[PDB]
Subunit: 440 residues, 3 copies
Amino acid sequence: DAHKVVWTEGMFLRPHHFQQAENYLEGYMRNWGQAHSGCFWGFLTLDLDQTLLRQGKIALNAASGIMPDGTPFRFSGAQQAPAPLAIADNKTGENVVLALPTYRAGREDVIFQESPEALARYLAYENEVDDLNAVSVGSAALQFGRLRLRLMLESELNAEWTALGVTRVLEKRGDNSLRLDTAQIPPMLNCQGNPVLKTFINDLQGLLQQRSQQMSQRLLQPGGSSEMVDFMLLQLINRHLGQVSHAYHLDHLHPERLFADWLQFATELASFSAQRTPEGRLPVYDHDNLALCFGKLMLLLRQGLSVVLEDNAIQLTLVERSHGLNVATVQDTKMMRDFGFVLAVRADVAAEVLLTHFPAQMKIAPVTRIRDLVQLQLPGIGLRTMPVAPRQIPYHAGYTYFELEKGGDLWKQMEKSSAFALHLAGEFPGLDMEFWAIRS
Amino acid sequence: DAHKVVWTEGMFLRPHHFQQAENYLEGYMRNWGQAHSGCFWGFLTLDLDQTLLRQGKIALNAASGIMPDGTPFRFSGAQQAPAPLAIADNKTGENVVLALPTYRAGREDVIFQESPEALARYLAYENEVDDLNAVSVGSAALQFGRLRLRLMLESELNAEWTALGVTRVLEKRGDNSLRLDTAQIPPMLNCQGNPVLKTFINDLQGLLQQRSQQMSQRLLQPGRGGSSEMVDFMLLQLINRHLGQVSHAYHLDHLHPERLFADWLQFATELASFSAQRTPEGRLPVYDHDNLALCFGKLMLLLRQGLSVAIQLTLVERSHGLNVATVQDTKMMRDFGFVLAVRADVAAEVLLTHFPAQMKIRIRDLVQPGIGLRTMPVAPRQIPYHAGYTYFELEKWKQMEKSSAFALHLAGEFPGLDMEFWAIR
Amino acid sequence: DAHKVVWTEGMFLRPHHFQQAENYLEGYMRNWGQAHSGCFWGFLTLDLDQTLLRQGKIALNAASGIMPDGTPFRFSGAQQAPAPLAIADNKTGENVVLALPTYRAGREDVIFQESPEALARYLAYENEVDDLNAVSVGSAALQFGRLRLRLMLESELNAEWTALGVTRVLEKRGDNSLRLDTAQIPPMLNCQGNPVLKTFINDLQGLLQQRSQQMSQRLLQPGRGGSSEMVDFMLLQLINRHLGQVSHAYHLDHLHPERLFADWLQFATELASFSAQRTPEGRLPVYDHDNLALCFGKLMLLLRQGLSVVLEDNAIQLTLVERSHGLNVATVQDTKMMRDFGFVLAVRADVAAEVLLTHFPAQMKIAPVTRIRDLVQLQLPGIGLRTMPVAPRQIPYHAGYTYFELEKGGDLWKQMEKSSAFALHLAGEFPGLDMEFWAIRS
């Protein structure tokens, strides 16, 4: 905590005065900045040297940003950059970072001669500079500070540094070339300065233009609920056409802002999943692991933008034919395989009667075999008693639920069929049945 | 790129030291600010002086903002104000700007006598100031730096300046005065700072309030319904969301135009769902901080389109039993339906049975039956509320798609009669 | 008007140069900062000393933020905090502020001797500091400046001060202790610096999780396919968007209140679509940085009205937060809650009814977090669960669920009463389990 210097008349100026006055004005600006920005550290720009990478070292041609302690930085050129960092010929799967010593008054801040692991924040160097006034006398030689930025392994870090993550090496091959994890993303203050973020945006805009035009075309060429639900999705997509177009053209865009919009998009999208609500832990923004959090977020977005809008459960209509014989037509070809089936049954007999006699007297089969089953006296599809109404169908007190058992040669003919045939022998007083299909 | 000045135990102090240290601090600030603000330059405030515009002279009474290079500034009054720019009868169609020289190390940016060709950033000047301490000896004359802010033509600009658009003269008239394109918008850091942006916000608010009351009123009342009904409720939700958004924008003391633009853009593109395309068509507007009039101009037109939406024809008397229903367009006659609002001092039951028969709509041929008239259980909500009336829909034939007016002729008496005739599309 | 200083060659140096130079630089940064932040003043952190509340004193342990005039500040410890403010016997319902005098060139800005009624911004003090270089000779003694922050009454303010609101004194008890209006919210720069804002977020999230769970389950079942089902689906959609929005808010380490308000206002005005009025009626709530309790208060109301499925506050749902396998934790939001409310578990599972009625009440052990685990290994009982033959009229009744009231009484109940959360562990043989935990006012 750096305080403001008092300057009195008759005061003898010492280097400390300026040193402390700099400390204070820096804290002043840092306090102002940190009070109004929540993820204030990371890279505005970062250019890693790809050629140097063949020689088993990580170099930075240029970079700019803010360190975790609030220190701003910017360097362009090998003379200005941190020492390249060589990688062991055995170490593997290590995170590399760009670190800087934390300020401390209990230790020297500026040094004039480099040192292995010295914690000074600056290195002194000399440079001639012009006076700035029109009237002047010549130039002057000053000493300046050079932030002691440093590339090192994450494992080498300790409480005396602040670091932005830069990359991760996965392999030092035989020929000394470095295999980087091109997926790890650094802390970024601007999505525009990282290529992965940029194509997250670019990719999403493409998904949205694509499904936007698929839908608008079909809604333009059919009035059911199915149509309304689709219009609702198109509406949600259309909102995010504008949003992501703005993100696509913006010169500066903090990733947190982008992530907030897209997380809302993803949870609203889950409305159209079969579950109707987000499932499991939501992605949480992590400014120092953007790759993990935008990765999960992008998966949800892609699932959501690829979902086919579909019913999870529907009631089939029993249509009466000959005495005791009902037929329920399946919607389409694929329903037989994508669904399970439950027969709900109410009757004014004891449950003991229902459970023993009803399955025995009901024969379910594809229409093509029901006559054979009755004429030859063979069972149909099996019925399994469910303990309680499933959750996808409405509870009706008094009803007993039976699940149709799949598998076997009879069920295989059912999968080729378009209608169930339910032929019941005898009678049950007050009998009522519902026939339900539930997605698997 | 300015670096930290190192101060050492015996050092001999040169103005260079202070000068360089100020640069390093200013650039430390600039670097923090620019790391976290995308469109960081523009005006917070701008008060051009009309009084000087009868004189062919663009002058600012006051301004505050940040230059495109990051330089903060603020001034008010004749003294601190940059020189007014007097303009030529030559000039028509050009932007005026407020500019500052860039800073390069290879030239002075303090000068002590003014000279238009100098690229110096500050003009030095004299002022005496008191000590801030309570243990003081007295005041002291110092030299301060005045920011050399230029009012110049955009054509005059070159790589050795940065500038902010201030306006753009379209006409230097014969009356030694100019007409300004009041539709041009400076780069703004706060929407409340510029009147065009403010009227943008106020006008979208009023229009959303209008459509909001418009749509809710219809949905509140019973009516026939139809496929549009659910769509109308969808659009009202969307409008209801933006009533809050725009109210917040309306009340904020500080709002950056980019934030406003990003919200309105998603609005416009969701809005397109309720247009015939079902999705936006063409190329979206793109936010341009230095051309706010164009981008917002486009967006605003998208919005007015999305937020845009029954007529009573006079039953003119010509005789008893016959009134003319001159439709004012033959176009009208096949896309609109037509309804008879009818009330008579007679029993409800008979007016529902007889009146459909003694009023048919070549006609006096038929008088010596007419178009089907169907009872309308619920009145359409587009017709204004009329308690106690019975509504009749004229059955949709084809003699009158080619004619131009209806002829109603009713058989005799239903005392105290009243009648309205409406067309709905 | 803090202009730049011209350092010429051969200039004679005086204190004034450095003084005006710090003015100029401070003004540079302040203009930068203020140009890009509305509502830039307030607290990031605020720690009131409760122990001193008991002597008629308002004292700040620590605080940080920005004053309305642009001045950042940070302090900690009684050595640096402002002098505590004694509240007189008669003040009641008065606002206490943190204040600082405004900079004026016509007045001295540094004083060396504390005095009352002096509008100086700084108080000079002596300290000694090492050289930051290694070419160092040794430490040097300097005079630093310390911000003259001060706690005072809102009524004692004038234009020579800016101030941030800290709290309101409602009553000075007989024993000279003070009771504060805990509902008032200081101007805040981070929602996470204030407990009341944090619980707004946490409450809204739990409501959205509750309505989301319930509505989705109803929409899973096929309905009539009419407009009423579409309305429901439209609302779950609106709830689902804000599940994500509030999750982000809940997890952000730093979030300015104005940003949160703008989102919630839009949420509210779109929710009015589902009200009888179909559109907002009356004056909309307006963000007020210096009265967040008021403006958020109105917003929270609208959102509770639009989302509640019970009458006023006859009942409150508790979120069962899963924290292990079979273990859930229902935090209660009050210490009074456990003496004024009944407690019910709405349960449904894919087991046989006779199994659910017998096994559930035995296999679900309910107790306080501290006292849970032993019971499981100790195989002792927990709070009893009584089947309810009619479901409460105060909470929604899902046909097909069974409702168990918690048996009150015993000694175990007392431990709960003084606890702040239920712990529930269940011997898990229950496919399809869905539960709701409700508290019902008596």
